Amino acid sequence: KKYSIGLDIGTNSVGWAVITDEYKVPSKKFKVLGNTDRHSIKKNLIGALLFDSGETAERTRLKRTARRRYTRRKNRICYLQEIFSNEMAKVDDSFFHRLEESFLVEEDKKHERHPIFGNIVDEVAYHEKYPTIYHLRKKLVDSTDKADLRLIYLALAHMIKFRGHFLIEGDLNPDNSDVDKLFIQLVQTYNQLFEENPINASGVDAKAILSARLSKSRRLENLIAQLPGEKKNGLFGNLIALSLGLTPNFKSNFDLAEDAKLQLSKDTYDDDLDNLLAQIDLFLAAKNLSDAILLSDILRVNTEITKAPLSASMIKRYDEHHQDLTLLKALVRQQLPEKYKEIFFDQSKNGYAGYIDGGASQEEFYKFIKPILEKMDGTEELLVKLNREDLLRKQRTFDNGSIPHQIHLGELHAILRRQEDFYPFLKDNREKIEKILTFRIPYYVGPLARGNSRFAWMTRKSEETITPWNFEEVVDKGASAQSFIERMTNFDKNLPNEKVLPKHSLLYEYFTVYNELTKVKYVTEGMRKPAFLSGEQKKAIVDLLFKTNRKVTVKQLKEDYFKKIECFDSVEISGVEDRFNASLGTYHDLLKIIKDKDFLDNEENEDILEDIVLTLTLFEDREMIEERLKTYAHLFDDKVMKQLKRRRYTGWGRLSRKLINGIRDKQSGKTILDFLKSDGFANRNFMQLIHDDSLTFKEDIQKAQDSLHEHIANLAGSPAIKKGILQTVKVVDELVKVMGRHKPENIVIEMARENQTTQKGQKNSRERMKRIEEGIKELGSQILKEHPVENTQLQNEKLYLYYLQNGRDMYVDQELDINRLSDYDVDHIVPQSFLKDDSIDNKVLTRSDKNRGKSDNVPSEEVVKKMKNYWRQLLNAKLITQRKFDNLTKAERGGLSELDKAGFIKRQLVETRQITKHVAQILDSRMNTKYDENDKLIREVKVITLKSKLVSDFRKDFQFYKVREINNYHHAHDAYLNAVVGTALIKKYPKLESEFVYGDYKVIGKATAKYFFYSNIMNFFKTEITLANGEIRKRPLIETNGETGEIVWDKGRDFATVRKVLSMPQVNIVKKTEVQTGGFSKESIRPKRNSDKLIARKKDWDPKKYGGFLWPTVAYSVLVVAKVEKGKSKKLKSVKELLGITIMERSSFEKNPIDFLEAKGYKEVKKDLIIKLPKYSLFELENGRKRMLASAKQLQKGNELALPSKYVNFLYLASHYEKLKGSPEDNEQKQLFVEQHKHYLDEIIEQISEFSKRVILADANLDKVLSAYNKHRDKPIREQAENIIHLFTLTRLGAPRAFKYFDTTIDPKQYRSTKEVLDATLIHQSITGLYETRIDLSQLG
RNA sequence: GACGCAUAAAGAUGAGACGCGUUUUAGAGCUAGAAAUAGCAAGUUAAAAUAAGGCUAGUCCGUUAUCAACUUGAAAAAGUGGCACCGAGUCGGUGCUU
DNA sequence: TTGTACTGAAGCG
DNA sequence: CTCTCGCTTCAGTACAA
DNA sequence: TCTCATCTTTATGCGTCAG
Ligand SMILES: [Mg+2]
Ligand SMILES: [Mg+2]
Ligand SMILES: [Mg+2]
Ligand SMILES: [Mg+2]
């Protein structure tokens, strides 16, 4: 009658088991459909479902964003062509048509094969005159001669297409604020304002600073040594205040007009001219030098004065490359002529031919040429250029991502200012072209859709087409920026129909502090027992303490209030240790800004303050903050307004305004905050207030409050989890359906939840500030002295990593700066192409170019050699972990490899936690569907959440050991053990049922005590319990309920039953059959080949001319039974085989299958015998061999090896020989057990041999591994067991893979023939596999 | 087993952008050559595409979830499969039942 | 002319 | 006043019929 | 890889949800 269901939810697996009250698993004769002769099969109610992962959406977002960027770039080019078209019609009416036709072969081209001029001599004259586009760009900016309009369009289209980045927002005018000369007019301006007119000697310019690196410790000493120091922090010339601003907002030093805070001159300095701009020169010239140092950092030098330093530097690279190429060729032909063919012709050995024509990247070319370079003579300058990575450089390079768009804009403005006299239409629409280059869609606007995108939120004032010139007249920036946030912030969970408060909201802070405060309790010598703080006390301490310190300590709560006001000798307190968890931080911010305490303490003006804080949270864009805030300008002075608009906030609370201050109790009239301020002597907190039935909040919340697919579709987060949710809920539903719709007595879920010692918990959850502090004092730096910081800004990951690395890059020996992390790179050690891992152990803050060059690799052996000492210096200083040092040093151990792809990855754990939590909620909501007027829910089925630790301990303590490498049955056995342990546990201790059952509750560090209890609770299974003192204690071999005489656990029959179930051969393993989504092919384009297999990259682009893709992903296979017109003497041969349908043909095939099959050559197709076959389709063959359909032309291992449990226990015990960590008598017990049962190894090998001969058929691998075993038989038991544990890779279900046994590696046998399953028996397995439909394919055709 | 707060890890989801990479063409290769070729010279850049494409034609969308078989239903979605016992190499056997 | 067996390929910071 | 988490299919080239 | 915001699940400290 009664039955229980146990569940184990892995990220890729759902173990399931059904048990009775006797801990026995039922077995039933299930009906089997299909045309086969089998009508009934006996199966056991235990199994697991295996499925491929749920994939995250973010890759699809990346493709979406790349698609959008390409479309918008094409539209920019189209806009420029639309502007130039009418003038282009005058000189060459087919110019854009030849540019559009550049990709076609000359036979396909409608016009002449030369795109630019249409004739060969002018084209070769162009390339001789301008070797690169940069030469043409420089000629257009610098010269004044009327040039051809085609060249003008080519330069502007090149520079618009590759416009550089927008991470600089200012003007950065690369035309006067640029020449290193600027120091001279700076020192004159300094002599003109500073009336003493000091020394203006011919000292060396900022090139002296830039000779090594831009830093404090060298700039300051160089300028002070060059020109004698009259004022160290007030030199008023080329200061660090005028180069790289200070970390804090510290006041001006030796001020001229006023003492005002200082920062860097990017975007937070334009109001620190309040010394003069608020009271009405060197700051302007300073800005111009700051610009000069940025652009001389990002571009090297122009010796002759040009408006285009970029093009000049690129031509400098070209000329250097040409000279060094000529020198290299001459020296190579001189000293080693035999290498000349390899270096300069063979493009496959990473030579110069491989560096240009081949695929070798710049670092590979350098490391190839370097030994050849050093063995040669006269190569000192080539080698020092190689060491600077400045040898034979290209122009188009990964380094160019450093370049801000302002440089390209400056060049465009200069070119247009040159050529506007010769072409009036350039002067007519110069601003339109500048807008085409400069315009960027704001991130808060999103896509520019018209009601046809699920991703778009932008609203528009008019229906006109959006152009960069009319963007502000059409797009309603306001509502769109608000809709960027409000669509995305979650609703209040108690009031589902309105949004939560901002985190920094004053009302939210008030609620938070009064909620914490109202269950503070205090006691003192006159008391009988502790009291709560009355409302007047709570108000007085809020006024005198919280409003006067940004945080409060219980120590000052004593020594400030209780000693002075209502004086006590002592008071003892509970509800708080040390720091209060709440504070009025925003109140202190607003007090510091408005400087009106009475305004903030005023009651009637709270709503406008909440409107302000809401505004300052929602909006980032300064003009939008201004516009929204402007309404309140008749209470605030313009100064304090222009200040307050800086005070950005972010993040959101959990509650609506109406919950905490909107709803009122009908009889009291008080809000929740009103009760928290004063509730007499009850002082009820929030939870009490929403669950006390006396107040009228409870039924108001109740009044504030179907398909399964809707129930999973509404909830947010990763789409990945929804797969798992649907799978296991469908499993549970079909298990209920199998046994005649009878509901379980309970469902047991293995939650991935734990408990641990309080000390360990706090030791983990420490503030990262303490970590930074103790590491930096351990390594003895002074970074905190010069750069001070507290915890909350380390929540930013770049600044955290900057303090983690002690202000210095560990790839390159240079100091880092704190103000310029914008262009600095976060870097993952392991490539994101290889393995998703976003732990701090895998993250680097490094200079951009170094990470860019570290494409697809761990840091290479050379940077390891350069930096391993500093890496060790940070390792022993507790700033990086051993995993971080091992990852950093990974190149010395061979770099990444297949065995580095092993070990379970962090995300799987978070996924299983999320998945199981949701599963538990949906199963409780679905199963308990009935309720009464007095009973709010009827516990028809108790969902019981076991912690993993309990079942894992039960496994070890009774030697039901588990390993994974042998078979997938471990999932099913874990589910069965969860069912057993949970059912026995709740049977033994009914008074603990309210702990484990979902939705129920009962009412030295607390976690410590709970963990110790969570150990002791399991003891009732044991026969003998060893206490902490080392003395044994007995326990009856029959267990009873205690309050009842009902037996709960017999240490006889029940252990035998468990061992019998664990040793059962028949376990249901079902791989979910899935039809493939995702990308059409592998993404790489492949060269022109006469091969038919090349997928056409475009409709007209025949890939036999143009190249194409390869490896088209098969969406699914289809069985076809038809005639294929075979032979020279043509005749119709009837034949049956699988066709693969690729994703590209999925929609075309499903539109009309018969016509698509006739397009493939099949005729007389039997339409009704077309079978849809997903991946992993299951086929049953002779002798009991099972083959899994991996693809239209590949099979997979479909059987599973049911090894006896004694061998599994012996294998687990033989490995991990000295790492059990129990007690010594136990380890020696297992040592004589494994020594006396050594022959089990041979028995296991015999089993593996039979099973391999039965279903694997890889006989060549079989005899190879048998010879390897017979060679290595005399090795110690440890390595033999370990390598045999590897050996089971031969026999697992699914994909063949390589494995190695001791010294020797075995390659997989590949089942590359799907002909042989065409006469097998196809199996349609249900979600559990208990329901089957076996079809015989030999009877078809 | 839930909720608010602080302190933690480890992860998600959407938008705006940058630089590379690859492909085809353009950038006249020269000499000795019956030549299969051999010697020499040169190589740095540009145009275009970047899931085929789709229609509501937007400077939008097209790689994330949804998926055993059969019977209904456009689809959504609904429905379809006896029990007890003795045993165990991927499940077998025995006995009642319509 | 068609199956095998073996080695190699794969968009990224 | 209630407790005792997982791992590949296709592209090529070279031989057996 | 850069810039923007938004969540989610587990760990520990505080408080609380019932009869
Ligand atoms: Mg588990
Ligand atoms: Mg998927
Ligand atoms: Mg990296
Ligand atoms: Mg499992």
Side-chain angles (χ1 to χ4, degrees), chain A residues 12-16 43-44 46-52 727 731 734 968-969 971-972 1066-1074 1175-1178 1186 1188 1197-1200 1293-1294 1323-1332:
Chain A
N12 301 276
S13 61
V14 172
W16 59 267
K43 294 253 182 53
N44 302 315
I46 177 166
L49 201 172
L50 309 180
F51 49 97
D52 298 358
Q727 288 315 111
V731 166
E734 202 196 70
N968 293 276
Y969 290 6
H971 298 302
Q1066 166 33 273
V1067 178
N1068 305 282
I1069 296 297
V1070 178
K1071 189 69 160 52
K1072 191 183 186 177
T1073 60
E1074 300 195 55
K1175 286 198 81 186
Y1176 318 119
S1177 291
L1178 182 62
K1186 260 177 269 263
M1188 254 172 87
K1197 300 169 192 282
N1199 296 92
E1200 185 60 287
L1293 181 145
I1323 319 291
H1324 287 296
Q1325 290 180 299
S1326 80
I1327 209 74
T1328 60
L1330 298 170
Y1331 300 114
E1332 289 184 358

Side-chain angles (χ1 to χ4, degrees), chain A residues 827-828 851 854:
Chain A
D827 159 25
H828 297 82
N851 185 40
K854 195 189 131 284

Side-chain angles (χ1 to χ4, degrees), chain A residues 903-1139:
Chain A
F904 284 85
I905 71 173
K906 291 83 162 173
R907 194 176 79 192
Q908 289 164 310
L909 203 297
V910 177
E911 288 177 44
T912 178
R913 282 178 169 160
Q914 289 179 3
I915 197 135
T916 52
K917 185 189 180 181
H918 271 105
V919 168
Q921 289 188 348
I922 319 291
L923 288 185
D924 184 35
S925 304
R926 281 177 76 82
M927 260 318 326
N928 295 312
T929 205
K930 284 192 53 34
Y931 32 95
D932 291 334
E933 56 279 329
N934 44 310
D935 322 82
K936 304 298 91 175
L937 72 173
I938 323 181
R939 295 304 198 158
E940 212 172 21
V941 187
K942 289 174 291 190
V943 177
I944 295 174
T945 53
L946 286 179
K947 294 177 173 64
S948 290
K949 188 158 181 161
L950 295 188
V951 172
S952 304
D953 288 351
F954 182 85
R955 276 190 168 277
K956 290 186 292 185
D957 290 358
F958 303 108
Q959 306 211 116
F960 311 133
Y961 305 109
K962 116 187 182 198
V963 317
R964 287 199 185 221
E965 291 90 330
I966 296 175
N967 51 30
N968 293 276
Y969 290 6
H970 56 270
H971 298 302
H973 293 318
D974 284 354
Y976 172 79
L977 293 178
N978 278 271
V980 172
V981 173
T983 303
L985 195 49
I986 67 94
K987 199 74 60 68
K988 170 53 185 203
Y989 293 118
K991 214 172 311 173
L992 300 185
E993 184 176 61
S994 100
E995 216 292 351
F996 303 107
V997 174
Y998 195 94
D1000 286 5
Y1001 28 85
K1002 197 258 137 180
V1003 281
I1004 304 303
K1006 294 301 187 182
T1008 296
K1010 192 180 299 294
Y1011 170 55
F1012 190 74
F1013 162 93
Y1014 255 86
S1015 74
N1016 296 344
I1017 191 181
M1018 191 53 28
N1019 293 355
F1020 80 104
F1021 286 100
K1022 290 184 166 74
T1023 53
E1024 181 146 310
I1025 316 114
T1026 292
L1027 280 299
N1029 67 347
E1031 170 258 352
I1032 75 101
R1033 144 190 161 171
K1034 299 296 299 293
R1035 154 171 315 275
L1037 164 143
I1038 306 313
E1039 290 292 334
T1040 180
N1041 171 267
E1043 159 272 354
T1044 324
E1046 171 56 90
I1047 61 102
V1048 316
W1049 184 256
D1050 183 339
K1051 299 168 195 167
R1053 63 211 290 261
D1054 300 334
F1055 280 125
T1057 304
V1058 165
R1059 282 193 211 282
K1060 182 176 183 286
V1061 173
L1062 291 173
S1063 161
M1064 212 174 326
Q1066 166 33 273
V1067 178
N1068 305 282
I1069 296 297
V1070 178
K1071 189 69 160 52
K1072 191 183 186 177
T1073 60
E1074 300 195 55
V1075 302
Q1076 304 305 291
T1077 75
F1080 295 157
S1081 303
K1082 282 198 207 169
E1083 301 181 30
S1084 177
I1085 305 156
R1086 320 304 285 182
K1088 68 211 299 161
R1089 189 158 142 97
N1090 206 9
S1091 178
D1092 179 338
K1093 296 207 302 288
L1094 280 164
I1095 305 303
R1097 186 148 63 106
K1098 209 69 92 149
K1099 234 41 161 193
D1100 295 317
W1101 299 2
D1102 159 42
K1104 290 47 171 162
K1105 282 180 280 176
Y1106 296 111
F1109 311 105
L1110 282 182
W1111 304 262
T1113 310
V1114 178
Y1116 51 87
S1117 305
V1118 300
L1119 177 67
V1120 54
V1121 176
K1123 281 79 168 200
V1124 171
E1125 160 48 291
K1126 197 133 33 161
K1128 315 76 208 181
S1129 58
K1130 284 172 271 293
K1131 45 146 288 316
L1132 300 187
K1133 173 31 40 180
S1134 186
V1135 68
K1136 174 174 58 171
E1137 68 264 29
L1138 301 191
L1139 176 69

